[PDB]
């Protein structure tokens, strides 16, 4: 909840996310095989970046 | 970006965490994982949007 403790957090969210609006773009012109794999490595940043930055503003409020 | 913008977007995704985190507590099988899943990813795109938004000026 610090602004020190969620800058890191929030920029890993961040990258992920512009990876992944990356990986959409791309999504247009990439070969299937290449896409699912992309989106694949794509969402699993984006859900371990979100669930880190969740599981650090829960055990925030547990205070 | 500012304290008020990000507060429902940190509560929406601390809820989809603590729902997540729950389905997975208890065991691509329910409804509620699909509905935590599908809560997951949308409360996670729409804070990233935004941090994303917010910085350009």
């Known amino acids: 909840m610090t602004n020190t403790d969620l800058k890191p957090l929030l920029d890993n969210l961040r990258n992920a996310t512009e990876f ?7 999504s247009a012109t990439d070969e299937s095989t290449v896409h699912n794999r992309s989106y694949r490595d794509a969402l699993d940043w984006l859900e371990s970046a979100a669930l880190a930055l969740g599981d650090a503003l829960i055990a925030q409020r547990k205070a």
């Open 20 to 26: 992944w609006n990356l990986v959409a773009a791309a």
